[PDB]
Design an enzyme around this catalytic site. Structure first.
Site, PDB file in Angstrom:
ATOM      1  N   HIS F 146      75.765   2.078  56.166  1.00 22.98           N
ATOM      2  CA  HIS F 146      75.370   3.406  56.621  1.00 22.98           C
ATOM      3  C   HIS F 146      75.687   4.523  55.636  1.00 22.98           C
ATOM      4  O   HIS F 146      75.317   5.669  55.904  1.00 22.98           O
ATOM      5  CB  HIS F 146      76.037   3.731  57.971  1.00 22.98           C
ATOM      6  CG  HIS F 146      75.633   2.815  59.083  1.00 22.98           C
ATOM      7  ND1 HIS F 146      76.425   1.772  59.511  1.00 22.98           N
ATOM      8  CD2 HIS F 146      74.517   2.780  59.847  1.00 22.98           C
ATOM      9  CE1 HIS F 146      75.816   1.135  60.495  1.00 22.98           C
ATOM     10  NE2 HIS F 146      74.656   1.728  60.720  1.00 22.98           N
TER      11      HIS F 146
HETATM   12  S1  FES Z   1      79.672   2.592  57.151  1.00 22.98           S
HETATM   13 FE1  FES Z   1      78.429   1.811  58.783  1.00 22.98          FE
HETATM   14  S2  FES Z   1      79.487  -0.110  58.715  1.00 22.98           S
HETATM   15 FE2  FES Z   1      80.691   0.650  57.042  1.00 22.98          FE
END
Ligand code: FES
Ligand code: HEC
Ligand code: HEC
Ligand code: HEC
Ligand code: HEC
Ligand code: HEC
Ligand code: HEC
Ligand code: FES
Lengths: 181, 235, 423, 423, 235, 181
Positions: F146
């Site tokens: 993400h």
């Molecule tokens: S930032 Fe979404 S899982 Fe590590």
């Protein structure tokens, strides 16, 4: 036309359905990894002639047992009469009579037969493994699944098993080896 | 141009001489580090690809490493029914069984094997133990070649594989100039085989099914047009 | 008559907006307030037992499959992982394994209750057909399942009960190979069996769906040769709450005994040899497949051309019908004739509570069933061969000849009227 | 009106003895000769497509399970055994994998057809509820299934879409561990997923049972805000053979395209990284779970406190509602609000073919769906964050506020009478 | 008499000192030939059986053979999480993990270990390499001891296992006469543990369930008697 | 009585049902073979300090990375302000501020901290594995699931990940070893 068009649509649907169904019934067949079904070199290598020798192959056992004189004489003294299967199931030769001379085995690359006998350890009734080491009511093999008495040379006796113990195609490797396949 | 292969399309059932050439190269070059466990040795006789002579297959199998057993620990004869060996570590690489799908695939291998040129004029010193590749994109890059925000200014990156071939590494028995490009194409096709052996059957099934279903659909369209006729005639 | 009492959806606005999906209408009108006679003994409970046992087996299996790994090298190990590490383990496995036993025990009493009180007689043929279909499915299921632990009895039971299909000529070996996934038994067979074993129960549930639909449309048999007199029917109390509670009481007792077994006598119905890993190279003594297949195993291994009543020497007229094929046909027929019964009993009468000769023959039949059960475990040596032959012959004789003769000359009894039997 | 035409069982003796089990009565009277309007466009076919696709998936899966071995050490190998040795192999796998894609594509068109022609409006609430329940079940199924090959994307998709359940406070880690069978992903998770994945389709079929029961009791929607005028109904031709044949024609076309894909473009919808074995120690770039979950993935990873419209800084009023939990609630709500729709649209009207403003908003909604699909794959770097936030906001706005305002001031259209539209 | 164990009944949760004695016996005698792969070592701390001290378990584990690995071939230190070793062949025997169920079970082991007396007065010479047991029934028998139709006239048969213990093979730390009989009983109980560790939980569940279901059944009987009262009162 | 008896039967049925259901929900919990969850001895053994070291344990990776001066100075120059998680997740010590002096690691059995840092390579967002080797917009780790940017010492920055990279309980084995657990 009404009849022609309707019936033809039905026929085409049926054909497509069958062409789609067949593989769902074909996948359950033996796959290529089972297609292989090749040979095995078992070395007799002095296993104290007279007791037994079993080896795995094709998913079934292959019995290689030397001969004990008493077992031999009992064998050679069996007339074809009163013998359920007199076909000598051994596939290394033709349908010659189920005789010990033909039924024992090739002769080490030499000339003798009453000393070794390698057959497929699979009861012809439904595929169980008979118990060896002199058992049953004939001094041979006994099937515990339904009670089939085999004789010294492996010919079926005293039970539902219709035929004797088959003999796969095998030749010798010059006095210490066996080739199964 | 793009040097399209034979199978790149609705046809192209894996020209087999190309695959035999790729095999001559794979067993003599790539096999030193790579393996193909997901590939049985008995597939070199199955149709579609290299329809070699079984006896040669058994010979080549017995001539490989020793795969011990599954029941009784003992170094056997590496029977064909077994799979190709596996090179795992200590200067070795991944498995090429399905590398032609884990990436348009074979073009990656071609344009990868193709391209190991010298270090560019940003970091000519390069790196010790690592070599440079025009198309690999998952390798390290020196700080001298990165931009202001970590992105690399090079086309590719540094791969741990050395150059696999020179100008004339091996001879072809059929008779053909064995330059680097032809070998790369051939080995790419061989790997695509190792990954998709059932390609031609795929295409033939697709043809048959497209045809039968077009027929069925046409007949159903006629039936529909008929049934719905007395309700779509006045308008 | 046949008062459905749909409830008219007059309860309230909730029961009025439910006019979108009828569902509660179905339940109430049909599957709960189904008029059932008053004359029901304790033999009309075993259907609830079977439904509950089926649910139990499905649940426990869905749980086990979260830890069972279908493969020759990891099945036994997974079973032990279950019985040791998992929280509940032994419980699920013992409840799954033994519950199969109860399932078949309960269907046996369900079936023999039926043969007595003319439940196969018209107009209840469809129920009988569906029940035999089920019986077949559940036998095949239990068979596929006994294999999964990859013990020692698994292998050989599979071997023989697949060599059967190979006995027949022309299309025997092909079917054998297509079923085993190969020439002999191996992981492929295991995968097939696991999948299949994890799928048929749902087919059984659907078939149970039709089983329940049928005998709701067709009235429950009742101890007598009488119907609910539809034309208002002071007899025929409803199902809920009376018979629901009666059945639940009996079911509580049965589960009590079942759990006592599970907790004190769990390995009793099993074969110890199924706790040793498999050796395709060595066969144990007295395979003895199981206890719910011994009757047919015996009917199979009885005909061997070893008696003066040996019809194999006569069937050898045709060179194709050998012994093995004869036994296989005999077993398939042992079941097909039980299915054909409703068209063999040529009696315009009903429950054998008013047919004495039928009572005697029927108790002889129950004894024959028990004997066959006890004989499939004992060797084929004298005298057991004569016993098995006699028993199979009587089974076939009953179901083929005995019922017609009775239907002809079997009415020395005053039938009871007024299913309201206030005695 | 609602002519069932039970056929009176007057055909012959066969159709008269079938008074034991009604079955053919059901089929004929209800599920074949169900009066359907004439005004049906090509958007009322996708239900047949979904039923056929479900059957296809169930069949192909039952076949694969005969060769798939659930275990970390033998899953990949079994999949290759399938694609190489088995006779059909690649076909079953590609048909299983891609058919999931078609399944979801078809449900999308099935659902959006519904939102347009007021199929959620009364009196068709139960169908909508059941459909959302199904959607949930089939999403969970496809998720459990993408894991079985034990590739590389399997592992990490499972990791994150299980860390979700752990985000919530108090009962997050417990649920996570109870679902994974442990702290992290391993064979236990694989067994659970295989079992579960091999069981839910039947629940879906039953739910499809109720789905079909509902809209047979409640009339099929029609392009117009009108019913079949029950009171005799020259409109409303039957289902068989007309609409059966129409749907089968469309289905033949769809299968044609589907098999062309399977045979020429099979690895197109997939992720190549799922062809490399798993490494719990190395994560690839752009996991990109799949294409039928990108909308909700984006709605999840949008809210991060990185915009002036960031409601996370405001939800931080309560110290428990952090970002993660907020996104999870946002996703669950994105679905719950779609389920609640029929009680939000305050319009005594029907199909948007007579509601222009609704047409515009609805096409904007379709565009929003496509955009969300395209955004879940692209990083969270500017500008995509603003885009995702806008799209999620519009989704929620539509389903919460837009429909009431329309139902208030959205009747500048002449509704059509006489569902017999002979134009 | 029959020397019933503790667990032989509706109670008897595996007297643990007996099991510790059996463990002293198994690791010092039977382990030389036999194994118990189906048995994790950590179970020597789980309740129900020998609730040994974990630290001693880790010590005893590290003091055993070397179980190499599953990922990287390398002889490890054999952590408790692994399973007991396996003795496979060349003068070795089967696995005793569940031998207490593959036969009333433990009584077989007791009356088997008990009984290796000299060869009887039918074949005093005996056999070379095979030794005699009075209870094993699956062994060979000389022709001198068989009857006219192959059945043996001996109680037991000839087993390939030698006598495992003498008069005072090992010492017990708790203080107890370590004759052969006590050791046999103890090791039998230990094997029964190794096979059925969850016995006591079984019994407690059975008790709880019997009770709850008897209660439910009584209440349902009362409800039935009530509902069916106005229809079974005049007769 | 009517009410009492009926309601009590219902209550008993419910109780038995629940006692039967609970284990169907308990079996899915971690089994004893997963209960183990013990330690691992990783040997630093001259892996060329400054790049990285990863080892499997508990099913998750344990990052052992030496320190590069530029990485260090960037670390030590981070005031607690503008730091998302200032708790120093490391469980080998109390909730002391997320400072590099406390956050790097024990001192080899000696006295120094700005040279080694072993943390749990598991993103706190949803458990992905961030990419190391100097990545992201802060010269540390980058999560590709993400987009969460970690810093040199592992404290979370620029993303949804709420907290930094935890630090398990670990002590040294006299200058060449690490004890994880
Ligand atoms: S930032 Fe979404 S899982 Fe590590
Ligand atoms: C050792 C001397 C090698 C021989 C000879 C060949 N390969 Fe290899 N290869 C090797 C290593 C150590 C690696 C890993 C590189 C890395 O940086 O991780 C590889 C990698 C490949 C790849 C994968 C590239 C990728 O994008 O990940 C391919 C497709 C590949 N190698 C092909 C290949 C071929 C066709 C070879 C014979 C002509 C060959 N390699 C030889 C090590 C070695
Ligand atoms: C080698 C020196 C052994 C030691 C020490 C012990 N056992 Fe053993 N055992 C051994 C062999 C070769 C066999 C096979 C015997 C045969 O004829 O096949 C066995 C067998 C057993 C059995 C199984 C008996 C049966 O009915 O099959 C048991 C229950 C058994 N042994 C128990 C046992 C115990 C408790 C030991 C320690 C006190 C022990 N054995 C030591 C080889 C050897
Ligand atoms: C959801 C899966 C599932 C369902 C449904 C199921 N079982 Fe099983 N069954 C299993 C598993 C897993 C095993 C292997 C583990 C075991 O033996 O307990 C098994 C094994 C068995 C065994 C052998 C038991 C043993 O321990 O040797 C029998 C007998 C059996 N099943 C019968 C049935 C019958 C009869 C039904 C229903 C009509 C049924 N099962 C329903 C999963 C299931
Ligand atoms: C081969 C025969 C057969 C089998 C097997 C069978 N049934 Fe029946 N069942 C019957 C008959 C006959 C009746 C009597 C119907 C009637 O009286 O109208 C019946 C009745 C019933 C009834 C209602 C009355 C009663 O006897 O309880 C239930 C409930 C029932 N069956 C359930 C089941 C279930 C559940 C199964 C299997 C899981 C099953 N049955 C298997 C034949 C069978
Ligand atoms: C009878 C078993 C079965 C049924 C029913 C079934 N599948 Fe599967 N599914 C499998 C197996 C086995 C695999 C693993 C082999 C594979 O990936 O093709 C799998 C894998 C998958 C995959 C991953 C495909 C791949 O190759 O990575 C998806 C997606 C999937 N299933 C979705 C579904 C959906 C959606 C349904 C129905 C709603 C469904 N499946 C029905 C057995 C089944
Ligand atoms: C979330 C919503 C939703 C989902 C998912 C859904 N349905 Fe529907 N379905 C509807 C609605 C609304 C209708 C319209 C009913 C009406 O017009 O009376 C409908 C109608 C139908 C119809 C008849 C008319 C048509 O549109 O073809 C069939 C057949 C059907 N659905 C099958 C299925 C099947 C099979 C599935 C899944 C495997 C499915 N549906 C999934 C909501 C849904
Ligand atoms: S199986 Fe060999 S005799 Fe029956």
């Amino acid at each position: 036309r009404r009849d022609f068009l309707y019936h033809a649509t039905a026929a085409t649907g049926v054909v497509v359905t069958g062409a789609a169904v067949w593989p769902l019934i074909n996948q359950m067949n033996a796959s290529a990894d089972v297609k292989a079904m090749a040979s095995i070199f078992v070395d007799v290598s002095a296993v104290e002639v007279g007791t037994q020798l079993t080896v795995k192959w094709r998913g079934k056992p292959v019995f290689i047992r030397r001969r004990d004189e008493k077992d031999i004489e009992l064998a050679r003294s069996v007339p074809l009469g009163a013998l359920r299967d007199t076909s000598a199931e051994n596939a290394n030769k033709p349908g010659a009579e189920a005789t010990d001379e033909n039924r024992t085995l090739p002769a080490f690359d030499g000339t003798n037969t009453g000393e070794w006998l390698v057959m497929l350890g699979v009861c012809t009734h439904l595929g169980c493994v008979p118990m060896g080491d002199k058992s049953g009511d004939f001094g041979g093999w006994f099937c515990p699944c339904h009670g089939s008495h085999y004789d010294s040379a492996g010919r079926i006796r005293k039970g539902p098993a219709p035929r004797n113990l088959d003999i796969p195609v095998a030749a010798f490797v010059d006095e210490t080896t066996i080739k199964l396949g | 141009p793009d040097h399209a292969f034979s199978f790149e399309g609705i046809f192209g059932k894996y020209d087999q001489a190309q695959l035999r050439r790729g095999f001559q190269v794979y067993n003599e070059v790539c096999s030193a580090c790579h393996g193909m466990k997901f590939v049985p040795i008995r597939t070199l006789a199955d149709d579609g690809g290299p329809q070699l002579d079984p006896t040669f297959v058994r010979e080549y199998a017995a001539g490989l490493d020793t795969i011990i057993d599954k029941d009784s620990g003992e170094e056997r004869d590496r029977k064909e029914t077994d799979m190709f060996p596996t090179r795992v570590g200590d200067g070795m690489g991944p498995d090429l069984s399905v590398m032609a799908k884990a990436r348009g695939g074979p073009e990656y291998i071609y344009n990868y094997v193709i391209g190991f040129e010298e270090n560019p004029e940003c970091a000519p010193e390069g790196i010790d133990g690592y070599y440079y590749n025009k198309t690999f994109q998952i390798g390290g890059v020196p700080d001298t070649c990165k931009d202001a925000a970590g992105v690399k200014i090079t086309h590719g990156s540094w791969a741990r594989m050395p150059p696999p071939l020179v100008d004339d590494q091996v001879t072809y028995e059929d008779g053909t100039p064995a330059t680097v490009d032809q070998m790369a194409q051939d080995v790419s096709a061989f790997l695509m085989w190792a990954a998709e052996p059932k390609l031609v059957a795929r295409k033939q099934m697709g043809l048959v099914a497209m045809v039968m279903l077009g027929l069925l659909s046409v007949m159903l369209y006629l039936t529909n047009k008929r049934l719905w006729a007395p309700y779509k005639g006045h308008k | 008559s046949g008062i459905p009492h749909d409830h008219y959806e007059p309860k309230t606005g909730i029961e009025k907006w439910l006019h979108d999906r009828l569902p509660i209408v179905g339940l109430v009108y049909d599957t709960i307030m189904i008029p059932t006679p008053k004359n029901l003994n304790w033999w009309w409970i075993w259907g609830i037992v079977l439904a509950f046992t089926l649910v139990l087996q499905i649940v426990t299996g869905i749980v086990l499959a979260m830890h069972y790994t279908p493969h020759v090298d990891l099945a036994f190990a997974s079973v032990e992982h279950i019985m040791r590490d998992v929280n509940g383990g032994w419980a699920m496995r013992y409840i799954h394994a033994n519950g199969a036993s109860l399932f078949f025990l309960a269907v046996y009493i369900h079936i023999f209750r039926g043969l007595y009180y003319g439940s196969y007689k018209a107009p209840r043929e469809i129920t009988w057909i569906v029940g035999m279909v089920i019986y077949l499915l559940m036998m095949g299921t239990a068979f596929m399942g006994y294999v999964l632990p990859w013990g020692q009895m698994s292998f050989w039971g599979a071997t023989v009960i697949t060599g059967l299909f190979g006995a027949i000529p022309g299309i025997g070996p092909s079917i054998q190979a297509w079923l085993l996934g190969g020439p002999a038994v191996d992981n492929a067979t295991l995968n097939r069996f696991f999948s299949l074993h994890y799928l048929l129960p749902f087919v059984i549930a659907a078939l149970v769906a039709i089983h329940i639909w049928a005998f709701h449309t067709t009235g429950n048999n009742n101890p007598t040769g009488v119907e609910v007199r539809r034309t208002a029917e002071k007899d025929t109390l409803p199902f809920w709450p009376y018979f629901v509670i009666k059945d639940l009481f009996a079911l509580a007792l049965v589960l009590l005994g079942f759990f006592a077994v599970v907790a004190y006598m769990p390995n009793y119905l099993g074969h110890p040899d199924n706790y040793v890993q498999a050796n395709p190279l060595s066969t144990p003594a007295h395979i003895v497949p199981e206890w719910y297949f011994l009757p047919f195993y015996a009917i199979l291994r009885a005909f061997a051309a070893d008696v003066w009543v040996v019809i194999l020497v006569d069937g050898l007229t045709f060179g194709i019908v050998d012994a093995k094929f004869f036994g296989v046909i005999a077993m398939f027929g042992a079941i097909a004739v039980m299915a054909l019964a409703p068209w063999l009993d040529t009696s315009k009468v009903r429950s054998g509570a008013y047919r004495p000769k039928f009572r005697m023959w029927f108790w002889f039949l129950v004894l024959d069933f028990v004997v066959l059960t006890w004989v499939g475990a004992m060797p084929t040596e004298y005298p057991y061969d004569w016993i098995s032959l006699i028993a199979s012959t009587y089974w076939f004789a009953y179901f083929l000849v005995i019922l017609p003769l009775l239907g002809a000359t079997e009415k020395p009894e005053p039938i009871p009227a007024s299913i309201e039997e206030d005695f």
